[PDB]
């Protein structure tokens, strides 16, 4: 699809068999999801945004569907204002910015 | 152009007579630039994201050139870690996300 930017680019994702809403975010290096349970071990990470840095849990090789497109990759879990699909998964679903 | 998302989508902008580098950010409602002077009136605003909120000055009806495309809109000025071009100006240059 072609997504214009007059509204927030919110899509449905599926992770852990559950549907959630998330923002397609070209300004984000990484994908950051609200507190949830994921399988496996995690590693520590800090990520920085407009108001400062937050600690997150890094889970690798997580199966996630984004607007119907399958991806398998790193998901960070922590106190984000909105679920964010960042470039690590936007590249897996073949997203580009065009103008 | 078509911009892939393997790396951060950084472009050159011209704002207030100055050249700056900025990130094309579909996850941002607003355009936020590091400290600089701009003409006309302003009013204070708080804008948030990961890590919390920052205080900015809001200037309306500012002309910017984004990778050679002129647009007019609101620009927020304050201590952002990255210059970001948000949806309020991405729409005006006809930017879309495609996959």
């Amino acid at each position: 699809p072609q997504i214009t930017l007059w509204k927030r680019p919110l899509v449905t994702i599926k992770i852990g068999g559950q549907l959630k809403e998330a923002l397609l975010d070209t300004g984000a290096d990484d994908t950051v999801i609200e507190e949830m349970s994921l399988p496996g071990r995690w590693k520590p990470k800090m990520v920085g945004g407009i108001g400062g840095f937050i600690k997150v849990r890094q889970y690798d090789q997580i199966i996630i569907e984004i607007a119907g497109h399958k991806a398998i990759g790193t998901v960070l879990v922590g106190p984000t204002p909105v679920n964010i699909i960042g470039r690590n998964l936007l590249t897996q679903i073949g997203a580009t910015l065009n103008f | 152009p078509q911009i892939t998302l393997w790396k951060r989508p950084l472009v050159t902008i011209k704002i207030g007579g100055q050249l700056k580098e900025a990130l094309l950010d579909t996850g941002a409602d607003d355009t936020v630039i590091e400290e600089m002077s701009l003409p006309g009136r302003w009013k204070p605003k708080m804008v948030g994201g990961i890590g919390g909120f920052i205080k900015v000055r809001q200037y309306d009806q500012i002309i910017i050139e984004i990778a050679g495309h002129k647009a007019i809109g609101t620009v927020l000025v304050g201590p952002t870690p990255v210059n970001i071009i948000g949806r309020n100006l991405l729409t005006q240059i006809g930017a879309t996300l495609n996959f």
Binding site: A28, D29, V32, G48, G49, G86 | I50, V82
Partner: peptide, 4 residues
């Protein structure tokens, strides 16, 4: 890492 930058999330913005």
């Amino acid at each position: 890492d930058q999330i913005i």
